[PDB]
Amino acid sequence: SCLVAGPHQRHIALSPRYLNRKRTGIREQLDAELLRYSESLLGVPIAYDNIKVVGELGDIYDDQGHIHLNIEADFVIFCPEPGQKLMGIVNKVSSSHIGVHGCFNASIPKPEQLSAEQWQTMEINMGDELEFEVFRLDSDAAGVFCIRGKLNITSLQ
Amino acid sequence: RSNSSPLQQMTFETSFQFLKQATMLGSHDELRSPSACLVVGKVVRGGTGLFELKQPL
Amino acid sequence: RITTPYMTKYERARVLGTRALQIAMCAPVMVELEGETDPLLIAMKELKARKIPIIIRRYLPDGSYEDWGVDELIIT
Amino acid sequence: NMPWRRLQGISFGMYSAEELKKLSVKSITNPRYLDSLGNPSANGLYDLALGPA
Q1: Do D2 and A64 touch (CB under 8 A)?
Q2: CB contact under 8 A, A17 and C25
């Protein structure tokens, strides 16, 4: 189960426009800008910030107008990681690849299946000629985290 | 020479002797003089810069 | 708790400057401005009404500090 | 949006001579630095790995 919770401290610089309305502004752009976008600091899709609080006070720094402060936030995260056998939606069968929950996109480059199974253009048949186009074995351990629309490269061996 | 600021003391005179000294001694600078504060782009530690403002949340 | 109760002129200058730089960045003005376009005039209007939620953090020469409120400070 | 990070202290010491290495993009060997027409001669003082002048 991808269930994850990570308590992390972030640094956020709030504009003086969001003084009376901080909780509104602490999220408007400074936290809602990487909404479930791959994180490299901890390997995290940021689902949503459940709570964003400040321990005490804010430090306006000399000429700068912004108010800098610290945000202790729990990121509820879905972590499919190496060591897991996940599922995948089978929609389109290709030689290049085989493209969960309608939002997690997964990939399967060519030489990642059992080579005992030979393919036909319209649909592919596996060992015992049993057609499987459904949530089934998908074990991803090589993961892209760079491209805007990231990937989830799944395996079955 | 009896001064605790290498960045000062080299903005005055004989800057290369005071740099050689500060270098062979590992001399540390605290960025509290006006000269050391204007060399590294800080706000001087007197007059208007002597306190914080600490906007409360 | 031991420093002077009044607001030094340098503190007034920096507080006005910071409040003005805040007002100019679209901050709410708690002073009911009356047609003036200068953020510094507005900051003075706010300082005269005792509406500035800033905390002057006076530093002593050994690192120890004292946090005063701009409201709890005798403006001359 | 400024860097936000400030300096507390500056110390002057001597570089190891072995850490200056890896602080070096390439070794220069060609004496004549000015090209026939005024451009940078490769491997000279003015080079295109030591930055665009």
Answers
A1: yes
A2: yes
Contacting residues for A150 by C-beta, under 8 A, at least 6 apart: A38, A105, A143, A144
d(CA D30, CA D41): 8
Task: State how far the Cα of A98 lies from the Cα of A119, in Å rounded to an integer.
Answer: 13
Residue of chain B nearest A22, judged by CA positions: B57
Give the 3-state secondary structure percentages of chain C, helix then strand then coil, rounded to 5. 35, 15, 50
Cα separations in angstroms, A79 against A32, A136, A144, A152, C41: 19, 18, 13, 11, 54
Size (chain B), residues: 57
Vertex B52, ends B49 and C1: CA angle to 5°? 110
What's the first-to-final CA gap in chain B, in angstroms? 46
Q: How is residue C46 annotated by DSSP?
A: H
- Rounded to 5°, the CA angle D13-D15-D18 comes to 155
Residues in C closer than 8 angstroms to A17, CB to CB, are: 25-27
Reduce the DSSP state of residue B20 to 3 states and report it. Answer: helix
Between C9-24 and C39-49, two packed helices, what is the crossing angle to 10 degrees? 120
Please give the method by which this entry was determined. Answer: cryo-EM
In order of their start, the domains of chain C are: 1-76 (3.90.940.10)
Whether the CB-CB separation of A41 and A11 falls below 8 Å is answered with: no
Entry resolution (Å): 2.8
